[PDB]
Ligand code: HEM
Ligand code: HEM
Ligand code: HEM
């Protein structure tokens with residue numbers, strides 16, 4: 001993805017303050033709440049029938065940590081996302097059967113979460129930079145679909 | 147855009163039978179009828195309030211020819227759509243102020259026009275190849291937007 | 293919002309389709325799976341090869357639903373009530389995909405109905421498929 | 434469809450916004466122009482630099498429209514009649530752009546309402562903004 005060096009620096013500076021464990025659970029939980037149809041992939045997680053059940057579900061929290069840990073690794077290779085997420089793309093297509101539109105939804109929910117978490121520090125230019133990142137990650141994850 | 151060799155052959159073969167002038171006026175006309183908000187760029191063309199008016203407008207016909215002629219030229223450079231369309235992308239962004247979503251809409255209308263014209267020859271695999279081409283051209287035209 | 297002209301147009305076009313409705317349903321599906329491969333993510337249990345009986349069978353069900361929608365164009369939300377429930381609470385297909393199938397249905401109809409697929413009818417059919425889509429996703433949240 | 438809970442959530446969040454509506458509307462616009470540059474194609478007559486007078490004035494008009502919508506949540510098609518007409522027949526903004534602005538309005542609200550922006554309220558606001566976008570594009574064709 002083409003971020004400028006000042007965009008790259010802003011993205012990394014902010015990410016160093018993120019607790020991936022907390023943010024991961026919040027982001028995946030909000031996705032399941034705001035866009036309920038995404039629950040279709042997680043029937044194995046148990047009760048997701050109300051917002052309180054979703055946000056308190058330990059499997060949702062654990063999975064959120066995994067997802068955002070993989071995202072975090074990806075931020076070290078902004079110049080080669082395709083390469084970093086290649087195996088994961090194949091897994092999401094062939095084994096998990098996840099419609100890539102879901103990666104885009106998660107991207108926007110994550111941007112909301114960062115804004116909620118950091119408030120005024122999540123400025124318009126910092127947002128713009130993260131929008132490029134989340135689009136890039138979604139595109140990388142969708143690359144091996146067939 | 148990557149087309150497999152059989153896709154390339156299918157695209158080229160069908161296009162050899164297309165009358166750009168006719169197909170161009172039909173695709174642009176249908177765009178303006180099916181998605182009337184696209185008329186916003188063509189106030190100077192005259193009255194566009196009915197399907198018959200639109201389809202018989204000489205300025206719609208003429209512009210359809212121009213558009214599809216450039217598109218035609220791009221089919222000879224499938225390996226470098228971005229460079230081929232760079233100047234046109236900058237023009238559409240900086241001078242004409244055309245939302246790139248319009249390029250996606252015209253692509254799908256063009257697919258429907260080819261199907262209408264060619265019937266059974268426009269098979270599922272041939273459509274798939276053309277969907278790749280129209281998406282590539284749309285992305286190319288959108289590339290220099292800023 | 294469908295106008296009387298739209299309803300008139302859809303009823304005439306769908307009428308010429310007639311007994312081939314199921315056949316066209318299957319072809320639209322095949323066009324979708326090939327043109328937009330991400331849609332296959334909702335059919336992991338299907339054999340998606342050319343001429344699959346599951347595809348032919350599912351195409352028939354989709355077509356029969358559309359025929360019912362056309363018959364009940366003035367009260368689609370009740371006529372499709374069972375389907376909208378099934379899509380919202382069970383199948384849970386992301387709404388973007390409805391646009392993809394709609395496009396492929398238009399392409400299919402265009403390829404089979406040269407004389408009837410005028411710009412006016414194309415426009416009415418597009419609105420009609422968008423309204424059906426809207427009904428099928430109306431109970432998602 | 435907005436439930437009673439959705440309406441309560443929206444009313445509570447927008448009330449907290451109160452006198453800052455206009456400031457937040459301008460911020461949402463700046464967020465959109467920077468994050469989604471294609472949206473700039475509809476404002477070639479504007480100075481889009483940070484803090485511009487046109488952006489400030491427009492943000493206030495957008496915010497006031499949303500305040501009106503919240504107050505007329507059960508009667509939105511009538512309350513937004515003039516705006517639906519204007520967008521459909523004069524401005525003619527492609528429908529895809531409404532979701533870009535809606536996202537940037539959500540981000541803006543998140544950034545300003547730490548206590549109030551719970552997962553339930555986030556969902557209700559997203560639904561509310563989709564409903565507003567639907568009304569504004571309802572007369573397009
Ligand atoms: C930022 C985008 C995402 C990333 C980086 C990501 C990453 C991952 C990783 C690392 C795994 C574990 C793979 C393994 O070793 O088995 C996984 C599994 C999975 N992901 Fe994704 N994910 C993303 C988005 C999504 C979204 C949006 C969905 C669906 C809405 C999804 C659905 C799943 C499911 C169902 C599993 C398997 C869960 C299980 O083991 O039961 N992912 N993902
Ligand atoms: C396949 C995609 C398209 C291609 C290849 C294309 C190509 C062109 C070309 C070659 C020109 C003439 C530029 C010049 O004067 O040097 C042009 C002009 C223009 N195009 Fe595009 N175009 C495309 C799609 C569209 C669409 C979808 C719209 C809006 C619905 C649009 C709006 C315009 C307008 C308003 C002009 C100027 C017309 C005039 O001054 O007479 N174009 N385009
Ligand atoms: C015009 C739009 C559509 C209509 C009218 C429609 C209608 C139907 C009908 C009638 C059924 C059978 C229900 C039953 O057997 O009781 C069905 C099932 C199903 N639909 Fe939808 N559908 C539409 C669009 C979509 C789209 C866009 C997708 C996703 C790409 C989709 C995915 C499915 C799936 C996965 C099933 C279950 C198939 C099975 O296991 O047999 N449908 N639909």
Ligand code: HEM
Nearest residue numbers: 472475476494495498499516524526530531534565566569
């Ligand atoms: C939440 C959805 C939106 C609402 C409530 C809204 C509301 C408004 C209002 C109140 C006006 C001023 C009308 C007047 O002059 O009295 C306006 C104008 C305008 N809107 Fe929309 N708008 C929305 C979304 C959008 C979108 C997404 C775009 C395109 C990106 C857009 C483009 C415009 C433009 C170009 C004007 C004319 C501005 C000028 O020339 O001063 N709007 N809108």
